[PDB]
């Protein structure tokens, strides 16, 4: 009432991969942007 | 015109352009497009030209 530091790091670890996971959809990769409506809102089928 | 290595630089701004008077004229010997195909100028939007 005053120790749980095991089971908080299950949680934990879980939840900072699924961030890292959302946060590479905004990254390029060697490409002009980042977003498809970008690159076909924008550029030829070829 | 202007010379070439005195370039003009004209910043046009908030208007309504149309690239397919350009784009269509036949006029033109060279049109090259880089970052975007021509045919989809006519609908897209930036902040300064």
């Known amino acids: ?46 | 015109f202007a010379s070439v290595y005195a370039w003009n630089r004209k910043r046009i701004s908030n208007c309504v352009a149309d690239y397919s008077v350009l784009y269509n004229s036949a006029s033109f010997s060279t049109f090259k497009c880089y970052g975007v195909s021509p045919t989809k100028l006519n609908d897209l939007c930036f902040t300064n030209v």
């Open chain 1, 1 to 46: 009432s005053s120790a749980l530091g095991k089971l908080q790091d299950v949680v934990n670890q879980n939840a900072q991969a699924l961030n890292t996971l959302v946060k590479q959809l905004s990254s390029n990769f060697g490409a002009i942007s980042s977003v498809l409506n970008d690159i076909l809102s924008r550029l030829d089928p070829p």
